[PDB]
């Protein structure tokens, strides 16, 4: 349990996934800072927080004597990451904000909070510090999208349709290794659906709209 060979194998993929995720979050928020001049300094602050998270999780892996399987993690994020990239190239800020500040942050919040109670004491302290920042990142995107809801609504719907299923696939792909780390799938699914559904309601979506938007992920 922590030093077991089964735990260490699963941690190799999970730890690689969180590190790769933080690294991409870093790049994502820097690109967003390019696209949103009025919030350029705030977004740069979010990016610097991501760099800290990445470093903290690299340390978690070293503490369990685990080599992160980065190749597995690259492939894990590829589709969703390339979608961000493409949206960024076409100037689609709304899509980029949805992917990184809503969908990805909600996923991280739900998984990290599930990991905390079963995490070794060193990783538990790191993750507690990390999840504190994730609330702020999600709050940034919700606040912006809520303030710009009418202009953003049509693109949000389209972005959700294309990208929510990718994250569900990512949630499903990670479920086995997560269980080995003592994180139950059913907790992950419920918590992610609740957080993302609640964030959509806060932004301004109706119930039928939230059910429609959620169902694109769940049917995948
Ligand atoms: C060592 C941490 C354990 C939790 C593992 C969670 C399993 C997969 C979810 C990964 C989500 C990473 C997203 C990071 C984005 C940060 O803004
Ligand atoms: Fe982060
Ligand atoms: Fe984040």
Residue numbers in the entry: 11 to 230
In the authors' words:
Cyanobacterial aldehyde-deformylating oxygenase (cADO), which catalyzes the conversion of Cn fatty aldehyde to its corresponding Cn-1 alk(a/e)ne, is a key enzyme in that pathway. Cyanobacterial aldehyde-deformylating oxygenase (cADO) belongs to the superfamily of ferritin-like di-iron proteins and contains a di-iron center. To gain insights into the reaction catalyzed by cADO, we determined structures of wild type ADO from Synechococcus elongates PCC7942 (Se) with different treatment (WT0, no treatment; WT1, co-crystallized with iron; WT-HP, soaked in H2O2), and solved the structures of two SeADO mutants (Y122F and F86YF87Y). SeADO belongs to the di-iron protein family, with conserved sequence of two EX28-29EX2H motifs, in which six conservative amino acids from four helices (Glu32 from helix H1, Glu115 from helix H4, Glu60 & His63 from helix H2, and Glu144 & His147 from helix H5) act as metal ligands.
The only exception is molecule B in the F86YF87Y structure, which contains the di-metal cluster while exhibiting the L5 conformation. However, the relatively weak electron density indicates a low occupancy of the two iron atoms in this molecule. In the molecule B of F86YF87Y structure, a segment (from residue 144–150) in helix H5 changes its conformation from helix to loop, which might be induced by the swing of Glu144 observed in WT1 structure. As a consequence, His147 moves away from the active site with a 9Å distance to Fe2. In addition, H63 is located more distantly from the active site, and the ligand bond between Fe1 atom and H63 is broken. The iron ions at the active site are bridged by the residue Glu60 together with a water molecule. The two iron atoms are maintaining their tetrahedral coordinations. The relatively low coordination number in this structure indicates that the active site is in a reduced state, and should be highly sensitive to dioxygen. In addition, a hole is formed at the protein surface as a result of helix H5 distortion, which exposes the di-iron cluster and the bridging water molecule to solvent. We assumed that the hole formed in the F86YF87Y structure serves as the access channel for the co-substrate dioxygen.
